[PDB]
Design a binder for this molecule. Sequence first.
Ligand SMILES: NC(=[NH2+])NCCC[C@H](N)C(=O)O
Ligand code: NA
Length: 234
Amino acid sequence: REDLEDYLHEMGEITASNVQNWLSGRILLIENLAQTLARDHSPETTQALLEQPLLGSTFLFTYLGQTDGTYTARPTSDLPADYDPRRRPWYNAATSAGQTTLTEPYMEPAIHELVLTIASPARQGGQPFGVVGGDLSLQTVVKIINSLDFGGMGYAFLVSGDGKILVHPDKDQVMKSLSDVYPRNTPKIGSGFSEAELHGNTRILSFSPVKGLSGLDWYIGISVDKDKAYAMLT
Ligand SMILES: NC(=[NH2+])NCCC[C@H](N)C(=O)O
Ligand code: NA
């Protein structure tokens, strides 16, 4: 029957769970770094803390955007001379969220590529002195969304609650609304399964929410080829 619906539900929960566990470990570093900088954030200690093998191999750039405009980042790169950390989208994201949150994908100014930033408000007893941040390329996340093994029948993407596709294997549909990519019979966020057409291919979409992301309701979208998926086992 439509036990394929049961398959898309389990794969959606497993993917959403694997993305949560993947982001939890990286959030652990930024919080551990923000709490250490809360105890000491002198340029001597901030330098030694920002350059360590665990942070360097995990994020493209690990940095502390201070409250007075001071910026320290590892590794260093070419940023505009008027670079103010407080005008950055990751600075206001951690401030408005009041906790460790994820930024929607934006253009990284140094390497010119889509990245998602983990950011925490660095405070010492409700007195914020800066915002700690770490950059994850959108390409890394896309690889983690599709780490599960499909039968070549579909893929998996990340979409927000409002319908804006965050990370996606197709670079075109990134940051575009769910209505833009699917103009007619736009899939609905949440349960259940929706039918749509993309590039002349009948597609079935399912959405499983990413549990555990404080401050965000992000859904793992699973878009599978309808005809290719109905090739079932015995
Ligand atoms: N010194 C650096 N290379 N910093 C790079 C990280 C900056 C951060 N991605 C931003 O958009 O503001
Ligand atoms: Na396909």
